[PDB]
């Protein structure tokens, strides 16, 4: 909507709201990110600190599919499974405990955040954080790797 835009209210006023001493000239800074070193410095170095410089190690033909370890916290491990598994258990009386396959539901690494509920389990995962194992064991559960 042109209808609602500023240019409709500027009509009549001369400079078109760009001031009249300094004007709406073409490119007075320099085009684009020019001057990050000289003359636009300050901006780049209180709002993009670290822009300039090299840092770290090259890696020539990166392929992202090698570093694909999506994670899940314990906090919500029981979200992977249908509520009635977590119900039938805290019941049953067998001390059966279910399995939660994490590599099924889309993660490869059970990280350690969250309180995990007093309810035995097994947890299949490609990886585990130390604390995530210790929380499962503390519950009364088996960390089970799977390649």
């Amino acid at each position: 909507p042109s209808r609602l835009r500023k240019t409709r209210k500027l009509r009549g006023h001369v400079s078109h709201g760009h001031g009249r001493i300094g004007k709406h000239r073409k490119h007075p800074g320099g085009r684009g990110n020019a001057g990050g070193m000289h003359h636009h410095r300050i901006n780049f170095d209180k709002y993009h600190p670290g822009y300039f410089g090299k840092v770290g190690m090259r890696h020539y033909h990166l392929k992202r599919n090698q570093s694909f370890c999506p994670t899940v916290n314990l906090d919500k491990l029981w979200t992977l499974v249908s509520e009635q598994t977590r119900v039938n258990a805290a019941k049953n009386k067998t001390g059966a405990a279910p399995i939660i396959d994490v590599v099924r539901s889309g993660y490869y690494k059970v990280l350690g955040k969250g309180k995990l509920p007093k309810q035995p389990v097994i947890v299949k995962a490609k990886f585990f954080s130390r604390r995530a194992e210790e929380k499962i064991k503390g519950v009364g559960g088996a960390c089970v790797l799977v390649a």
């Binding site: 007075p28 800074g29 320099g30 684009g32 990110n33 001057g35 990050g36 636009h40 901006n43 780049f44 709002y47 993009h48 822009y51 599919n65 090698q66 694909f68 598994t85 039938n88 258990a89 049953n92 067998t94 001390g95 059966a96 405990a97 279910p98 399995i99 396959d101 590599v103 099924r104 035995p120 097994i122 990886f127 585990f128 954080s129 130390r130 995530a132 194992e133 064991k137 009364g140 559960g141 088996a142 960390c143 089970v144 790797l145």
Partner: protein, 210 residues
């Protein structure tokens, strides 16, 4: 100029983009056209599956997709051989054949075989003339269907086996996953070095004798 806080950003409008902008006012037409041609391919290949040819189960590559399963390009030669199909005939009964597929694992091999076994079963091979010879299926399964299969033939469903609620043996409990990994990772790292130090030690023991 920049002005107080916000992504430095490099946008790629430096070459003559306007000369080469591609507009999608086609698209609807093109959805229509393709579809027509699609419908006409079906009506051409009257009872053959519109989908096209039967394609095999295949795992995707790379630790990422790994767990998912797709359709393949075509069934490999081991898989035909075992299912008992001549490779030049497979093309003629609606069976996709690529030949470049190695077959490493015995599991996939038998899966695909089980497809082809399944397929040949539920296939309604018409005869050459209306005058029936061997192979070509009965007038029963012909009248009751000269019927297509809409949708990919024997669709490739990526499936799970449910692991029942166990007990967790004390021996199962005991495991120390976090460590075992860290060790394992290390033992890979170091495998080469150690065996150089061992090779040096065995040389020192032999050198002691002479």
């Amino acid at each position: 100029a920049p002005s107080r806080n916000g992504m430095i950003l490099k946008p790629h409008f430096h070459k003559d983009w306007q000369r080469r902008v591609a507009t999608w006012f086609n698209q609807p037409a093109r959805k229509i056209r393709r579809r027509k041609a699609r419908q006409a391919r079906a009506r051409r290949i009257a009872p053959r599956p519109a989908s096209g040819p039967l394609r095999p189960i295949v795992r995707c590559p790379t630790v990422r997709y790994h767990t998912k399963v797709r359709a393949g390009r075509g069934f490999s030669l081991e898989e035909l051989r075992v299912a008992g199909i001549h490779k030049k005939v497979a093309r003629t009964i609606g069976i996709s054949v690529d030949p470049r597929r190695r077959n490493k694992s015995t599991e996939s091999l038998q899966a695909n075989v089980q497809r082809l076994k399944e397929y040949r079963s539920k296939l309604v091979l018409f005869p050459r003339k209306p005058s029936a010879p061997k192979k070509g299926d009965s007038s029963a399964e012909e009248l009751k269907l000269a019927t297509q299969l809409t949708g990919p033939v024997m669709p490739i469903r990526n499936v799970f086996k449910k692991e029942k609620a166990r007990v967790i043996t004390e021996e199962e409990k005991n495991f120390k996953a976090f460590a075992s990994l860290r060790m394992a990772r290390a033992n890979a790292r170091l495998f080469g070095i150690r065996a150089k130090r061992a090779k040096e030690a065995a040389e020192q023991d032999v050198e002691k004798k002479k």
